[PDB]
mmCIF file of C-alpha atoms and ligand atoms in Angstrom:
data_model
loop_
_atom_site.group_PDB
_atom_site.id
_atom_site.type_symbol
_atom_site.label_atom_id
_atom_site.label_comp_id
_atom_site.label_asym_id
_atom_site.label_seq_id
_atom_site.Cartn_x
_atom_site.Cartn_y
_atom_site.Cartn_z
ATOM 1 C CA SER N 20 -10.076 1.834 12.753
ATOM 2 C CA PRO N 21 -11.630 -1.342 11.364
ATOM 3 C CA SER N 22 -10.959 -0.416 7.715
ATOM 4 C CA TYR N 23 -7.141 -0.096 7.893
ATOM 5 C CA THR N 24 -4.372 -1.128 10.273
ATOM 6 C CA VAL N 25 -1.096 0.715 10.712
ATOM 7 C CA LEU N 26 1.807 -1.752 10.542
ATOM 8 C CA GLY N 27 5.347 -1.607 11.915
ATOM 9 C CA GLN N 28 8.482 -3.711 11.505
ATOM 10 C CA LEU N 29 9.631 -6.199 14.097
ATOM 11 C CA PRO N 30 13.238 -4.928 14.478
ATOM 12 C CA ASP N 31 15.914 -6.670 12.386
ATOM 13 C CA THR N 32 13.344 -8.902 10.641
ATOM 14 C CA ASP N 33 11.142 -8.887 7.524
ATOM 15 C CA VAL N 34 8.047 -9.259 9.700
ATOM 16 C CA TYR N 35 5.420 -6.510 9.603
ATOM 17 C CA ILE N 36 2.424 -6.473 11.923
ATOM 18 C CA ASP N 37 -0.104 -4.287 13.727
ATOM 19 C CA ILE N 38 1.904 -1.553 15.437
ATOM 20 C CA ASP N 39 -0.340 -2.083 18.460
ATOM 21 C CA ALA N 40 0.120 -5.898 18.635
ATOM 22 C CA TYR N 41 3.602 -5.909 20.126
ATOM 23 C CA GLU N 42 5.530 -3.249 21.975
ATOM 24 C CA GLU N 43 8.849 -3.470 20.117
ATOM 25 C CA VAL N 44 7.246 -3.237 16.674
ATOM 26 C CA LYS N 45 8.179 0.153 15.185
ATOM 27 C CA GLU N 46 7.169 2.167 12.167
ATOM 28 C CA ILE N 47 10.003 2.901 9.728
ATOM 29 C CA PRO N 48 10.916 6.598 9.531
ATOM 30 C CA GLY N 49 9.767 8.002 6.180
ATOM 31 C CA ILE N 50 7.358 5.132 5.401
ATOM 32 C CA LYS N 51 3.689 4.630 6.305
ATOM 33 C CA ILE N 52 2.443 1.080 6.020
ATOM 34 C CA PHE N 53 -1.324 0.482 5.974
ATOM 35 C CA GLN N 54 -3.001 -2.876 5.841
ATOM 36 C CA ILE N 55 -6.298 -2.677 3.937
ATOM 37 C CA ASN N 56 -9.050 -4.312 6.026
ATOM 38 C CA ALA N 57 -12.093 -3.145 4.023
ATOM 39 C CA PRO N 58 -12.710 -2.078 0.423
ATOM 40 C CA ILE N 59 -10.455 0.836 -0.274
ATOM 41 C CA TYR N 60 -13.173 3.468 -0.748
ATOM 42 C CA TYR N 61 -13.893 2.930 2.972
ATOM 43 C CA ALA N 62 -10.245 3.063 4.113
ATOM 44 C CA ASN N 63 -9.835 6.145 1.903
ATOM 45 C CA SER N 64 -12.589 8.066 3.711
ATOM 46 C CA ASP N 65 -10.684 7.518 6.981
ATOM 47 C CA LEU N 66 -7.405 8.707 5.426
ATOM 48 C CA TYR N 67 -9.335 11.932 4.848
ATOM 49 C CA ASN N 68 8.093 13.571 6.521
ATOM 50 C CA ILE N 69 7.054 10.560 4.324
ATOM 51 C CA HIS N 70 8.544 9.397 1.012
ATOM 52 C CA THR N 71 6.568 6.140 0.578
ATOM 53 C CA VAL N 72 3.143 4.821 1.483
ATOM 54 C CA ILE N 73 2.896 0.991 1.376
ATOM 55 C CA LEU N 74 -0.543 -0.476 1.057
ATOM 56 C CA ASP N 75 -0.742 -4.125 2.105
ATOM 57 C CA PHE N 76 -3.320 -5.941 -0.068
ATOM 58 C CA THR N 77 -2.832 -9.372 1.534
ATOM 59 C CA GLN N 78 -6.469 -9.406 2.770
ATOM 60 C CA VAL N 79 -7.955 -8.186 -0.532
ATOM 61 C CA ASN N 80 -9.469 -10.938 -2.709
ATOM 62 C CA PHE N 81 -10.860 -8.778 -5.525
ATOM 63 C CA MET N 82 -11.441 -5.153 -6.492
ATOM 64 C CA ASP N 83 -14.466 -3.474 -8.075
ATOM 65 C CA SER N 84 -14.337 -0.506 -10.482
ATOM 66 C CA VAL N 85 -15.120 2.031 -7.736
ATOM 67 C CA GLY N 86 -12.159 0.709 -5.696
ATOM 68 C CA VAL N 87 -9.747 0.796 -8.624
ATOM 69 C CA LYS N 88 -10.745 4.405 -9.463
ATOM 70 C CA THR N 89 -10.285 5.341 -5.787
ATOM 71 C CA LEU N 90 -6.876 3.696 -5.657
ATOM 72 C CA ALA N 91 -5.835 5.390 -8.898
ATOM 73 C CA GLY N 92 -6.715 8.736 -7.287
ATOM 74 C CA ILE N 93 -4.701 7.964 -4.165
ATOM 75 C CA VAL N 94 -1.650 6.951 -6.237
ATOM 76 C CA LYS N 95 -1.917 10.005 -8.458
ATOM 77 C CA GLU N 96 -2.334 12.546 -5.659
ATOM 78 C CA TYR N 97 0.533 11.282 -3.493
ATOM 79 C CA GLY N 98 2.591 11.009 -6.691
ATOM 80 C CA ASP N 99 1.910 14.628 -7.523
ATOM 81 C CA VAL N 100 3.851 15.624 -4.348
ATOM 82 C CA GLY N 101 6.575 13.090 -4.976
ATOM 83 C CA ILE N 102 5.341 10.351 -2.630
ATOM 84 C CA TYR N 103 5.217 6.800 -4.031
ATOM 85 C CA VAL N 104 2.289 4.535 -3.140
ATOM 86 C CA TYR N 105 3.344 0.870 -3.342
ATOM 87 C CA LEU N 106 0.942 -2.065 -3.503
ATOM 88 C CA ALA N 107 2.163 -5.124 -1.548
ATOM 89 C CA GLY N 108 0.673 -8.613 -1.657
ATOM 90 C CA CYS N 109 -1.774 -8.255 -4.533
ATOM 91 C CA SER N 110 -3.110 -11.580 -5.713
ATOM 92 C CA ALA N 111 -3.195 -12.481 -9.386
ATOM 93 C CA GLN N 112 -6.943 -11.850 -9.260
ATOM 94 C CA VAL N 113 -6.492 -8.355 -7.784
ATOM 95 C CA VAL N 114 -3.944 -7.444 -10.450
ATOM 96 C CA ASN N 115 -6.449 -8.743 -13.044
ATOM 97 C CA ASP N 116 -9.104 -6.419 -11.652
ATOM 98 C CA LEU N 117 -6.666 -3.516 -11.603
ATOM 99 C CA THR N 118 -5.819 -4.271 -15.244
ATOM 100 C CA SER N 119 -9.482 -4.600 -16.349
ATOM 101 C CA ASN N 120 -10.265 -1.227 -14.821
ATOM 102 C CA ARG N 121 -7.324 0.351 -16.652
ATOM 103 C CA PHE N 122 -5.114 1.059 -13.618
ATOM 104 C CA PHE N 123 -2.081 0.184 -15.771
ATOM 105 C CA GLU N 124 -3.153 2.338 -18.776
ATOM 106 C CA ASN N 125 0.274 3.821 -18.059
ATOM 107 C CA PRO N 126 2.460 0.687 -17.839
ATOM 108 C CA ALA N 127 4.926 2.497 -15.553
ATOM 109 C CA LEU N 128 2.417 1.887 -12.724
ATOM 110 C CA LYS N 129 3.463 -1.797 -12.838
ATOM 111 C CA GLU N 130 6.545 -0.611 -10.995
ATOM 112 C CA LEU N 131 4.387 0.046 -7.887
ATOM 113 C CA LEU N 132 3.694 -3.652 -7.382
ATOM 114 C CA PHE N 133 5.644 -5.817 -4.908
ATOM 115 C CA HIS N 134 5.040 -9.307 -3.583
ATOM 116 C CA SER N 135 5.676 -8.651 0.103
ATOM 117 C CA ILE N 136 5.823 -5.624 2.385
ATOM 118 C CA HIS N 137 9.507 -6.162 2.902
ATOM 119 C CA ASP N 138 10.024 -6.166 -0.888
ATOM 120 C CA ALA N 139 8.205 -2.794 -1.052
ATOM 121 C CA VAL N 140 10.383 -1.416 1.753
ATOM 122 C CA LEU N 141 13.543 -2.434 -0.076
ATOM 123 C CA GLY N 142 12.132 -1.064 -3.303
ATOM 124 C CA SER N 143 11.717 2.347 -1.699
ATOM 125 C CA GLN N 144 15.375 2.502 -0.683
ATOM 126 C CA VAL N 145 16.665 3.908 -3.991
ATOM 127 C CA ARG N 146 14.523 5.059 -6.931
ATOM 128 C CA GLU N 147 13.896 7.840 -9.424
ATOM 129 C CA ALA N 148 13.026 10.971 -7.422
HETATM 130 BR BR1 BR I 458 -11.701 -2.267 -3.702
#
């Protein structure tokens, strides 16, 4: 797909890249990591035993209101079956757009933000169930 890329972990590192880019790269059991390559309403249409979905926002420079509403729906619906959706690598600008479009109307959703993918992975290790 051009709109998302599935990432894996280079074993025994904090490096996450395209699962197809290198043979020894492996997905982490229980976690799906998707790099967003196009506005999320696109990647979402493709989407349509996992405890955590990590969305890598490193390539995202801004979000529009349609995208934030789409993301909010993704977070809510996974959440409703107990799966956390983490947002990794959001720029200050992206978090500003999220905020403007009322993504953090419930301030608890700030806990879904992490600076790096590895930070998100570690954050999924132990948390309220
Ligand atoms: Br977006």
